[PDB]
Automatic annotation (TrEMBL), chains A, B, C:
This is Phospholipase. It holds the Pfam family Abhydrolase_2. Residues 167-343 form the Phospholipase/carboxylesterase/thioesterase domain. Transmembrane segments: none annotated. The keyword Signal applies. GO terms for molecular function: hydrolase activity. Signal peptide: none annotated. Keywords: Signal. The keyword Translocase does not apply. It comes from Thermotoga maritima (strain ATCC 43589 / DSM 3109 / JCM 10099 / NBRC 100826 / MSB8).
TrEMBL record, chains D, E:
Residues 167-341 form the Phospholipase/carboxylesterase/thioesterase domain. It comes from Thermotoga maritima (strain ATCC 43589 / DSM 3109 / JCM 10099 / NBRC 100826 / MSB8). Residues 3-121 form the Esterase Ig-like N-terminal domain. This is Phospholipase. InterPro entries: AB_hydrolase_fold, EstA_Ig-like_N, Plant_Biomass_Hydrol_Est, PLipase/COase/thioEstase. The keyword Transferase does not apply. It comes from the Bacteria. Keywords: Signal.
């Protein structure tokens, strides 16, 4: 048996282990396979618990790709329920700092299975061999040293593919929330669908597009939110660092300066507002999700298309925070939109009301809308 | 213990008691509070039944506002399930006349609770002290005497706030259904989300805007629906009265004559159609929900933007009623839209199929759409 | 007792028997009727199973029309749950060929019922007397002999009504999937909501419109999908036949040549792509649902408005199939849209992931969108 | 169709319709029969409501008797569920007087069924052509006027079948049950398993015997219970003694095994019967009643097994305690089975209904019969 | 309000709060009373938690006694559910030593209630003014120091009421239960129905008798079980014999029906008691214990009924087998009821807890009492 590969995918609520792919020395028909032949367990933290297997099938790809036409291949897929308790890869530390658990699995083929050549492959158990992160392992990693400050910002960058280099494509920059702050250069891309959505085939196929995901570094913030109990709206070192890495990106890549979009939640949201306000010239449009908020400075962004999102009953970042801005924006001639989710609506869907970014990145309108903005 | 305040909010299906706020002489941390410490009961009609408490928390506001940051305050909030049987404030009388039950509650703190100062507040029970109606207690009340007829129409009016008086804002006039007919000048604003939606922060913050809610007076109707088994489409005294109170409103207030929107359901819907047809000049746009219907007269409204709404299986006001109008409108060059909800769709969501206004006022498109109309 | 009429309606997932209407010699008040007075059973195949009755009511129409105002009439309606196991009329044969079961019912009035005249109608049992197919029995049937080939294509055609003959209306042509291939000239109209949606009152009332539903004939396909394991994209005899029957339609009917829309799923989808590519001049706009796919030939359709739909996890027609086209379209200047449903999304709603046409025809945007296209 | 016959059967809780037996003009292959092919509803009292069909079959018999070896033919039994809400024939009106609603049933055959050669059989609907009461229609009915007190007492009498007439058999006398006071000469025997348990084959093959169920008229009691102190003979009980004498005169009954048993008011009834005629009876099972403890000496020699649920809310458990205590301390021949609080509610029975598990206690039955003089 | 009184009752599983009795200053019409009108919570140990009110009413009594005929007045009983998680007064600490948390309850009347003339009665909240322990507060408490071994033994003693003093009555001696070792003179009698079953009216009206529940101090056992071989008398058991003698000296007790019974360690206790003083006892029910099989000859003549669950994970079922086997082969007078694997888990009891169904087995009770010398 060649390998056992854990597969992760980023779901609205974060990255989860979503399937396990086993590479058999020979092919195998899944025409005959079945979930109860197999066992998948996660360690947390000193015991194992069962992940529940929803489907089973085989292919030669190695992906989650399945055809009712050729249910055979050296790769057997074990698709797992995303509703499982320990499906997440990120445990929520307290304060505002999550951590992503070194992944720990054990898999078993419990009974013999019929192979195509054939006819009998003997039961095995194995810890994993491989992680393979969907729509995360496509972002290159780079660190950046702000030559003027010292501050080092890790960042992940998605770069379109099969795409004529003689055109220029947009850039969606993503600022993450306090929870993904860190140093591992991974959290920012796995915390929620903030960076990754823009990189999904479904969208790339109609709007290619770079994505940038800077990670901002445990003890600080994008804005001066966590660095100044005086006023949280000012540009902090990390945010400035990032503007420079946008500039680096412009320099190196067929990036259309006219369509630099920015978005982020919480700290990343506060951060979006600050970015556009301290650099009105830089960005084509913004989606700030549950942040704030320098009202004196809305005059600058009067001409930037902006869709705001906040849940009414968010108890971490008060909704008044977004209302103040939108209200002032609108009366001033804005160019602004605002979906504010109803009290309960979030809970109703199984979401902390603070996680207002979740329906947001699942909004086809918002994404389509963002791409029709330009300068 | 200073006070016990019932809080009502208008939900799609009507006003419900949604929380109870207790004012304690000292502050209290909810960091330590919990639903099972407390009891909330409603009288109906000679016995009490339990309202079920979903959350518990404390603040200094007095509102449903909660921060995971300062779960303390002289106000303790007891949030109640909106799914409870006797959560409504309006019992449906038979015929077509609802009544709103004088509200009758009793609340108890069942065990001692730790205060911040501290440390021990002793169990109590109390009937209520206060009602405090969210997004209803913002509409001023006024009665109007139609000097030409005699007819007295009570009305509630919402008036934007924090808003430059040197600009002019729109006016959304709301005509309610037979069920809210009356004299108490409350029903029209609590029957459903018809008046109140337009006054929600989420919308006011991007389109300020007056709202008018005339109440029409038990034995009559907006159109001659209930006053003439000959043809129901003609302007009845109440509807005419109202046009005059629009005129009063224009006179007194920075109301933009170009953006007078009108909407209503059933009798209020029939009434919307009549209003625009007998005063094509007055209104910028209309949303008529399950009404009718003077087809001869569609030529006048040929230029008014109109979105129609009716559920297919409404058994009170037949759907053909809306189809006839829309059909004739469209072929004539309308300027019309039409969402007709599928048989079952309503039931499926827990709604009488006659209550087609419910998804409607919960439609972001419809609201956004209404505000981009003007003359 | 005059008659017992089975009523069918086409639901997203196919035609189902949805109610039973009994014609009584006298009138009857349903004011007093009730489901438990009655029994409805289906044969499958040598035993009967219970259909579950959700409502009961009476009218004089004979339709599913109900008024809380006149719950009386010679027609008693027995509305049945659409969630029943043997509610469908089509059993899925294996391979790619469904068949529609000759319908077999037995109904009983189990106890006496009070009539209006009155007062006592005696229990009965009866097999059915009548089928009466909603929004299917409106399409005329015609067969066509392609004079150049020999191929005979049956087809169903919907023709607007109450509509000025001096204007011209659009034509929505529907190509069905392999499953509805056949000869009975019915399957194509009952397999899913593909033809019928466009004929629903809700839409006809705002966009009248012909609908054409050719049926393509067991051993073949619209494109050369099933007729050439070399390349599936070429025009097959049936598809060509159909273009000619469009021409027949133009000739005979007030059909606006500028607004000939085309749509279809699977084989019908493959077929849509081919149609527009081999006749760029003929069609105003297209919605191809899970098909393919001649990439070399996208240059021709560069100017046709097109909304593509495919579910990510469709295992019959791979999603890459639609992505390839959309991707190439877009970079070439398309005029294209693309909703690709998320892995799981379908299953989540109770739908085979291959049935991506189901949310699609239930999309108000897509329908509204289609009608604003023209030449 | 030749007929549709209801079948009643006395369950611990009382009488119930528990089968509908449908008589065909041919022979039906029950092999292929199914509950979902029929429907049975009971009118109450304005509307009808469904009865749950639990099983189906197919004998030549006509009784609720089924054999896996021939599931055929002429007769078709539909067994109904006894957890159905409207399975009770008796409805407790608002008092101590229940009543037996005349039975109203409609029965339909929903689909064609295959007969034995098969051959379809085409659907029908019908009201019932028949009632038929198991074991309960096996008790002869008689009335007796007290010659004496005018006061007429209806009785039901079970006679052993078909056993050697030149021998004497025991007599079991049952006393209901304020609930069953009346005139129909039916309530006393349908209220519960009071009189019927003795009559079931399972007990009759081994202790063949007569059983006597008189009926107290309304507005009276067996003891002076519902007149007032409550323990002296009332007209009705007096009259019953005479009926016993009448039966001895008329029947081969063993005078040394006349047993008495009763149930609530019948239970008072029982204690009074024995304390006032201590010579007459060989043994007694008073269930949740009471009686004169100043007269316990009189009965010190009769085997007695006393039954009462501790959480009884109608007849204070205390009434048995006092008697049992005094009895045992004075020499005895007494038994006591005091059901624990909760036990009754645990088994779905009103805690006053202690006769329910009692008459179902095979040890108590066998015990009674081991008595004599 | 005059008072709020908790009511404890010994359930097979141990002691529980099962009613709160609320004393008004007027008379309440229980007819109109409802569970949803009150709330009762038990503090444990930091927070409180809800108790389930299952029933409500309304007597002048004060006990858990209800009559449908007057649901009134002064006193109001709220019965609590015994399937509640925190219904146990005793919490098993981590060992063979449980403990009885001082009872902490808060009780509220949520709505006005109609009194008998009615007349509202206005809501209140209160902690408890009272405990009150059913049957358990009917055993006098005494201590005894061994004059002898210093070793002090607390005991509870039940005395028959109110029966003829010029007669001798049996004595039942109960031995807990490592769990119930202590000093409070309460655990032995609350752990389970060990001592109380004998005291319930249902058994007392028919076999009136004394019962003795001594308490083994902690760190000891009745036999040498928790010292070490485990079958010889320990200080505690020795002392208890003397208490028996003391009671005979002090009380009208029939020396020919002194019965011994115990339960786990008390069960060892029992086998040791009899093998070391074979003259003293008339019969014995050892429950899941063991003992010296080399000394079985000694006891060959005492009626004994042995009980033990086969899947016991504390005291190997084998210990009873060996004794019962040797006993029967040697002449006997022995019974054995070995509960099948699963039976205990089927009924919600720890398979070690075999005393639970045993003390609930009315056949075993009646059996013990049929013994003598």
């Amino acid at each position: 048996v060649k390998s056992v590969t854990l597969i992760t995918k980023v779901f609205p609520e974060g990255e989860k282990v979503c399937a396990v792919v086993i590479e058999y020395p020979v092919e195998i028909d899944g025409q005959k396979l079945s979930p109860d032949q197999f066992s998948v367990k996660v360690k947390t933290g000193d015991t194992y618990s069962s992940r529940t297997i929803t489907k089973v099938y085989a292919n030669n790809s190695g992906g989650l790709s399945f055809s009712i036409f050729n249910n055979r291949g050296k790769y057997v897929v074990l698709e797992l329920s995303t509703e499982d308790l320990h499906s997440n890869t990120i445990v929520f530390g307290p304060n505002f700092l999550n951590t992503r658990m070194k992944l720990d699995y054990i898999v078993s083929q419990l009974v013999p299975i019929f192979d195509v050549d054939g006819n009998e492959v003997e039961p095995f158990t194995s810890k994993q061999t491989d992680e393979k992160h969907l729509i995360i392992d496509d972002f290159l990693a780079f660190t950046f040293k702000d030559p003027e400050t010292g501050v080092e910002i890790p960042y992940r960058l998605f770069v379109p593919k099969d795409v004529n280099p003689d055109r220029k494509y947009p850039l969606v920059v993503f600022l993450h929330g306090a929870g993904e702050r860190g140093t591992d250069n991974y959290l920012q891309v796995a915390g929620n669908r903030g960076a990754v959505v823009w990189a999904q085939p479904r969208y790339q196929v109609v709007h290619p597009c770079f994505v940038l995901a800077p990670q901002c570094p445990p003890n600080s913030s994008w804005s001066t939110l966590f660095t100044d109990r005086e006023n949280p709206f000012n540009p902090e070192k990390p945010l400035l660092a990032v503007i420079k890495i946008i500039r680096k990106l412009l320099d190196e890549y067929n990036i259309d300066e006219n369509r630099i979009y920015i978005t982020g939640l919480s700290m990343g949201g506060y951060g979006t507002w600050t970015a556009i306000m301290e650099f009105p010239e830089l960005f084509a449009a913004a989606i700030p999700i549950c942040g704030g908020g320098d009202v004196s400075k809305v005059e600058r962004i009067k001409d930037i298309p902006i869709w705001v999102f906040h849940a009414e009953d968010d108890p971490v970042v008060p909704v008044e925070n977004s209302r103040v801005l939108v209200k002032k924006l609108a009366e001033i001639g804005g160019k602004v939109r605002y979906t504010e989710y109803e009290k309960g609506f979030m809970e109703k869907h199984g979401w902390d009301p603070h996680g207002s970014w979740i329906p947001t990145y699942e909004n086809q309108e918002a994404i389509e809308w963002l791409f029709e903005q330009s300068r």
